[PDB]
Amino acid sequence: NLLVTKRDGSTERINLDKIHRVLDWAAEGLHNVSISQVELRSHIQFYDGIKTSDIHETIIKAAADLISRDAPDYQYLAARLAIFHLRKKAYGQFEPPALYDHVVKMVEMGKYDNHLLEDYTEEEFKQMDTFIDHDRDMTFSYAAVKQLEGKYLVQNRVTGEIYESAQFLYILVAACLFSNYPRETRLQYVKRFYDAVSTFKISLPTPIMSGVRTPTRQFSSCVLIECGDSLDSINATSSAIVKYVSQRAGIGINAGRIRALGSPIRGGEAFHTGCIPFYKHFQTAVKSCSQGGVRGGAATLFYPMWHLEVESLLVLKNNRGVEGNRVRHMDYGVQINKLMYTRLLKGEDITLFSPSDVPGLYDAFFADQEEFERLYTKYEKDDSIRKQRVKAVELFSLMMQERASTGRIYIQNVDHCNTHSPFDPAIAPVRQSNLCLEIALPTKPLNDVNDENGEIALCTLSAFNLGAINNLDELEELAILAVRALDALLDYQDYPIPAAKRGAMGRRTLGIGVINFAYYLAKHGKRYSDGSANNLTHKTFEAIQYYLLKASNELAKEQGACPWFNETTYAKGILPIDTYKKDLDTIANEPLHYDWEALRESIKTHGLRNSTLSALMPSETSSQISNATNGIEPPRGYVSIKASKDGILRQVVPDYEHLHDAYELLWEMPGNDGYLQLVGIMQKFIDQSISANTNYDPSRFPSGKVPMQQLLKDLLTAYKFGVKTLYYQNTRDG
Amino acid sequence: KYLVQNRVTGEIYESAQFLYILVAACLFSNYPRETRLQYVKRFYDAVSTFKISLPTPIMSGVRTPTRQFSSCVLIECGDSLDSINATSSAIVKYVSQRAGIGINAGRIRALGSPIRGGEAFHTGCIPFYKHFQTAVKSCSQGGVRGGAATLFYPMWHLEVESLLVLKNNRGVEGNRVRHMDYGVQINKLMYTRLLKGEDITLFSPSDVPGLYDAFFADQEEFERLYTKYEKDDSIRKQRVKAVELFSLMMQERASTGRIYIQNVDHCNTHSPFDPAIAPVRQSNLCLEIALPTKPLNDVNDENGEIALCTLSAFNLGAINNLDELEELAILAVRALDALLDYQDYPIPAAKRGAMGRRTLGIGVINFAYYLAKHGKRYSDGSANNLTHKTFEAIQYYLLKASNELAKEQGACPWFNETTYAKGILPIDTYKKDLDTIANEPLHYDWEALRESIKTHGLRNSTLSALMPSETSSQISNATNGIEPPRGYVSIKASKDGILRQVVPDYEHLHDAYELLWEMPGNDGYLQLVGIMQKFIDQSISANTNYDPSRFPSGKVPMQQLLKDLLTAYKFGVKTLYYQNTRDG
C-alpha cells in the first residue's frame, strides 16, 4: 500500500502516478536524463507514513545527485522539481496567484513594503501581471534555485516558510526602482527591466535582489573610508566601520596617513606607539558584528609602499610571530607608483618615511608624479628628516612573498588610478580602493562620525551577462535600464552616515561590470592565454563603456548632471580613450567603432548623471543564478561543487556539450600574460578598476617552486599595460 | 587450514576429496546399513560440488581424533560473584578451543549499588568487563591475535554512557575495555523517546524488579514497569535526552565500526521461542545467532544454560533452481544433527542447551553473484521479490527436513518451549511493514507443514541464521555471505605471495554486479535483510555502509545514521553488525 502524511496531518495512499507525471513534466525538453533512474533512487527511500514535503526533497535530491558533465540536463530536471515544490510551499498550488492578490497579502503579513500599493493601482498591477511569464522559472539550473531559496526569495528565517517565487521578486524589484517615473513611461520601463533581469541579461547584488520590495532600505554593500592622522579621525573611522558592517557591507580602509611608530608627541594624543595597534582596532571594528568573531565582516586596508613601518605591515597576515605583531583578519593593498618600480629595475634603494615628516609627499603620491619625484628626492637629501633605506629588491621580494603565502596582499598602482580616471586628481584624487580592488573613488577623512565635511565613497553595482546577448548593440537598451535602475536606488536607499550620503549624492557613482566572459570567449572561439581574444575584448569593452556613458549622458539631460560633475575629467571633455596607457597600442589594433567625438561634445554640454559607471567585480552568487562563468575569470573546472545541508550542489559550465574544447580552464593557461593583456585592454575603457587575479601552478616550475623572478615580471607586465590593481593571487595545490 | 598435515614438519597427508568423503562417512556413521552409504554418497556430492559449505572446525577436524567442533557459544552472566566466576571459567574453557563468544553482562548491577551482604558490586560493571576480556584473551598468542567476544547490555543501564565509550582510544586505561565488541540492546519504547524528542531514564537492573525480564519477554509489561519506576522518586535513576544517548552510541558505532545493535523486541515477537519460557536475551560474536540462555552458579551448574549453534550454508550460486534445496536441506540438517551427538561438551550447561534444543544455524553464500546472474541489484528494490521467493524456499525446506527427522528420530527434548509447538510459524509473526515492499506470494504449502509440525514436532528448535563467511566462500569462489563484494578482485597477503581471487563469472557479469561502494545508500540492502528476516529463525549479520565522499564536506551526517537505524527497525531487522566506513 504505502501511506503519506499530507500537509496538515491527514493520511492518504501514495500516488505513484502523480510522482511520475511531475517527473515527466520536469524532464520535458531535456536530454540524456532517466525518469526511471530518479524513481528507483528515491522510491527505495520512502516509508509508510512519509510526509509529503519529504517525498519532494527526496526526488529533488535524487535528480540532483545525478548531475554530471555527461548528463548536464539533470541540473534542469532537479531545478524544475525544486521550483514545483517551492510553488506549493508558497501557494499551496503550482499556479501562482494574481500579482495584486499576492502583493496585498504580503503587505498584510509585513513582508512587502506598503509603498508598493500606494505607488501603483490595482489596474497597474493587473497590467504588470501580463508582463510576467512564470515559465521563466523553468530556465534556472539547480544551483541557481538553491541560491534563490537560500538568499533571494522572501521567507521566514525562523519557521522556514517561503513566501514568493522568482518572477514576483523580479517584477517587484522593477516596480520599486521605477516607482517615481512619470505615468507616461513608468510601466514601459518596468516591463523592459523585468524582461532584462528575468532573462538574465542584467545581474544585481544580493542586497538588492533580497531587499528591494521589502520594508528595508539597507542596500549599501560597498564602502570606502579614509582615516586621518588623528585620534578623532581614527574614532570616527572605527565608528563608521561598525555602523556599515552591521549592515554586512564590505569595507576599504585607507590608513596610510597614520604617522609611524616613534613619531613626535602630538601635544596630547598617542601616535608614538604606531600604526599597528590602530589596525588591530580597525579589525575588531570590522569584526564587531560577526557570528563568533570569524564568519562575516570583511575589509581591505591600504597604505603606501614607502611608509616607515612597511616591513612590519607587509607581514601582518603571517602565521608565526608574536600576537601583537599580527592583524590577520583583514586583507591589505600596498600602494605603488612608477618611481618605486624604477628603483627596483635600477637595483637602487627605496627610502621609507613617516607621512607626518614629509610635507606634501602623501598628497603628490596620488595627484602629481612630478611633484612626487621632486619632493621625494629632496627629502632623501635632507638629513634632518627621519628616514630608512632599503634595497628595492628586498622590499618587493618581501611584499611578493607575503602576497604568495596568503594570496591576500594586493597591489594598487596609484599613478594609473589618477592619470587614467574620471576624476581630476588636483580636486578629487583616488587614494584607495575597496574590499575587492575594483572600486576607485575619492574620499575625505572624518572629524567625527557625523562630520558633514568628510566623504565616504559608496558604489552601487551591477553586471551585464555577456553570454545572454546576441550582439553588442543590445547593450544600448541594457545600459539605459541598468543606469536608470541603479540611479533611482541612490535616492531610495538609506544613509546611516552623513559623509557617505555626501559621496553618493555628490558623485552618484555606479559600478557596472560583466559576467560570463569566459563562456563568451569560448563561443567566439577565443582564449585567454594566447592573445587571440585581444581585439574582441577591445571591441566588447568599447561597446559597454560607450553605451554606459550614453545612457548616463541622456539621464543628465532629463534629470540633471550630478552635483559634483565639475570635479570629473569628463567635465573637461576628457574621455577614457584620451588617457589610457599608450602601450596598449602594441597588443591590439581594433579601431573604435562608435562615435566618441559626438559623445564628447554631448558630455561637455549636458554632463553625466554619474561620475563613474563601470567596474569589473568578482561574482559568485549572481553568476550561479544565470549559470554564468564568474566575472571575467576562467572556470577552475567544468563542474563546480558546493557543500550544503541539502547535499552536494553541482553546476556544469554553460553549453559544456558543444564547448568543452573551446573553454580554457584556469590551469590550462601556460602563464599570466594573455589574461593580463585582456585586463589591460578592458581597463582602457573602465572608469574604475578590475578585480584581476594572478595564478601560479607550482608543478609548471623546476622543483615545484614559483620563482620570484617570474612573480616580479608579471607585476611589471601588469604595470606596463596600465593595470590599476591586482587582487587575489591564486596558487594551485597538488 | 583444511587438509590434514604436520604443523611442525610441513608435510601434507591428504587431498580434498578424501577430506570430503570422510567428513561424510563420519557424520552418517550411525545410520542404518540400508541407507548409510546413500547418505554418504549424496552428502559427498553436495560438498564436493560446493552446494553446501561447512565451518573450518568441521572441515579440518571431522575424521581426526579430535571432538572439538563448537565454535559459537553464548553465555549469560548473573548479578553475583559466583556467576561472574562461572562465566569467566566457561569463557576460558571455550576460547582455548578457539570458539567465538557472545557474553550477556547487562544484569550486573551498576556502580554505587547497595552492599550485597558480602560481595563487591559497589565498584561497577567495568572491572568485571575487564575480567571477561582477559578471559577471552587468555589463550591468545601474545594477548592480541586469537580470542573474540561481543558483550551485551541494555540501552537503559545506569552506566550506559561509560559503557558506550569502552572501545574509545583516548581516556584513562581504567575506563577502557578495547578488545571486545559490544551490542546495545534496544526496544520500541527507547526509539519512541528519540522520535518524540523526550528523555530516556537509566536504571540499575538491581533496583527495578521485573524490568529486565519484561524488556525481552513482554513490551506491555516493560512499558508499565518502566513508567512506574520513572515516577517512583525513591528509586535511583538518571535522565538523559534520547538524542544525546543515541548520538553517543551512533558516534561510537561510527568510530570503531564495532558498537552493534540488537532489537530485543523483534528477537522475541518474531522467534522460534516462547518468550515467557525461553526468551532470547543476547546474540553471539557476529550478531546472527539468537538463542535462550540461563546464568550459571558454578562452571558445572546443571541448571545453567549455555547456547551453542552448529553452522552451515547453502551456496546460492551452485544451484540451478530452488527445488534442489529440498535434498540439500535434508543432507545439511541430518549431517549437523548427527554432529551434535558426536562433538564434545567441556561444560555441562552447554550440553544442556545443545541436547535440549538441538539448535542449527544454516545460512547462505554467493548471494551477490546469485542476484547478478538473475539481473537484480541490492540498492534499487529490484531484488525484493526474488529474495522473498528464495528465503521462503530455504526455510520451508529446512523446516520440512527437520520435521521429517523428528518423525524418524524424535523431536528435540525441549521442543515444547518453541512457538513452533503452538503451531506458530515465521510467516505468522513477521513485521507487517514488509508487505509494503514485496508482494511475492508464498509458493509452498505452509498449512500442510503447520499441521505436520504441531503433530510430529521438529528435530531442531532453530534451523536458519545468516552468518558472515570468508574461508568457506573463498573455497567455493563465492561472494561472501549476503554481502556485495568491495571489488572485482580480492587481495590477500601470505608468506607465499599475493593471493588474488576474481569474483565468479566476471567475464559475463562485470556490469551485472553491484559493488559495495556503487550502492547510493543503505535502504535497498536493509529492505533485503528485512525480507530475509521474515523467514529466518535467528538473525542476520547485517552491515551498514558509509562513503564520506558522498556527503557535503566529507562527513556522514548523524541524521542519516539515525534514519538508517530506524529503517532497520521498521522493517523488523533484529540486529546490526559491522558499520563500514570507506577510507579515501
Binding site: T5, Y47, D48, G49, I50, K51, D54 | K188, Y191, T192, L194, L195, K196, G197, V243, S247, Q251, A254, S255, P548, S553, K555, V556, P557, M558, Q559, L561, L562, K563, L566, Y569, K570, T581
Partner: peptide
Amino acid sequence: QIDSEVDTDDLSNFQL
C-alpha cells in the same frame, strides 16, 4: 568524519 547536528522535527514524522 561525522556531523553531529540532528533535526528532531524531521525525525518525529517517522513511523516505527
